């Protein structure tokens, strides 16, 4: 409906993106995407999630695949450093540490 992404919901997806290290979203534009972050089942509309990851890819920050209507976004080493600056942290994702 709207691609206007409020900032509070923009950082929530990024924190999940850095925490888990990967995001999967079914390609439907009438639907919502949920994620579990410390018990918070914060939800974003699919169209907003789809719009946020289109900007990261075109800046050479993530790697993307598609199979059976489902997206699969994975962030690059260039993206990893970028998210560290934006979120002001120094961890190593989650499937990277150990």
């Amino acid at each position: 409906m709207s691609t206007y992404v409020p900032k509070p919901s923009r950082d929530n997806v990024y924190r999940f993106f850095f925490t888990e290290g990967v995001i999967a979203c079914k390609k439907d534009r009438m639907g919502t995407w949920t994620g579990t972050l410390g018990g918070n089942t914060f939800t974003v509309p699919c169209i907003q999630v789809m719009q946020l990851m289109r900007s990261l890819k075109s800046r050479n920050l993530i790697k993307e695949q598609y199979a059976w209507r489902h997206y699969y976004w994975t962030l690059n080493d260039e993206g990893i450093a970028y998210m560290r600056s934006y979120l002001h942290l120094a961890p190593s994702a989650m499937p990277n540490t150990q």
């Binding site: 888990e20 290290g21 990967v22 999967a24 695949q65 598609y66 199979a67 994975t74 499937p95 990277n96």
Partner: protein, 202 residues
């Protein structure tokens, strides 16, 4: 509530079909050659088969952990309930899934088509195959499509048992102009349906 038997079997069948398609697109350059899984009471372990297991694993299993988390999110598996292992294929000269990807590698590079197809046939025949066949077709030269096949050895083509003594694969290779599709058929050496041997007495 529980689902019926007719629906449990079908629901567990479209899970394998989607899993195969997902792993086919990721580990295509690494040489994916089939995936199997076995549900237990504690976990849902899955086994992959590739000829480049070092590249599939990744640094400290990075690639395997990125693949692990993709499946968990899509199917909503709970944490600690899913596991994947990678095993190595025995002989790479007898899997048309890996051979076709070696062929595509030569084709996406500057390689002669005949010199490319002769390599695959000679290799698999040397590796111990019983019959091989390579087909390359579609806008090979000029604006008109053409088909070029290369056969060697013996190969059956009819009946039902032809689905067990023959392996096959396909791919679509994106050239600068048009598309090219290549197939490789390998005859893997139960006896043949119509062979009879008489035991030597004494």
């Amino acid at each position: 509530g529980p689902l019926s038997k007719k629906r449990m079997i079908i629901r567990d069948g479209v899970f394998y079909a989607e899993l195969f398609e997902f792993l086919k697109r990721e580990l295509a350059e690494e040489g994916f050659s089939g995936v199997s899984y076995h549900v237990t009471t504690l976990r849902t372990e899955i086994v992959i088969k590739a000829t480049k297991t070092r590249e599939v694993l990744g640094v400290n299993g990075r690639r395997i952990r990125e693949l692990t988390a993709c499946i968990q999110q899509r199917f909503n598996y709970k944490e600690g309930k899913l596991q994947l292992y990678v095993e190595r294929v025995e002989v790479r000269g007898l899997s048309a899934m890996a051979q076709v990807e070696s062929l595509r590698f030569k084709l996406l590079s500057n390689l002669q088509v005949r010199r490319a197809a002769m390599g695959i046939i000679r290799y698999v025949m040397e590796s111990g195959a019983k019959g091989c066949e390579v087909t390359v077709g579609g806008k090979i030269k000029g604006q008109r499509a053409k088909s070029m096949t290369f056969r060697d050895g013996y190969m059956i083509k009819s009946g039902t048992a032809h689905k067990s003594f023959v392996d096959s694969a396909c791919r679509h290779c994106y050239m600068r102009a048009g598309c090219i599709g290549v197939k490789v058929k390998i005859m893997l050496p139960e006896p043949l349906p119509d062979v009879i041997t008489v035991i030597e007495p004494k």
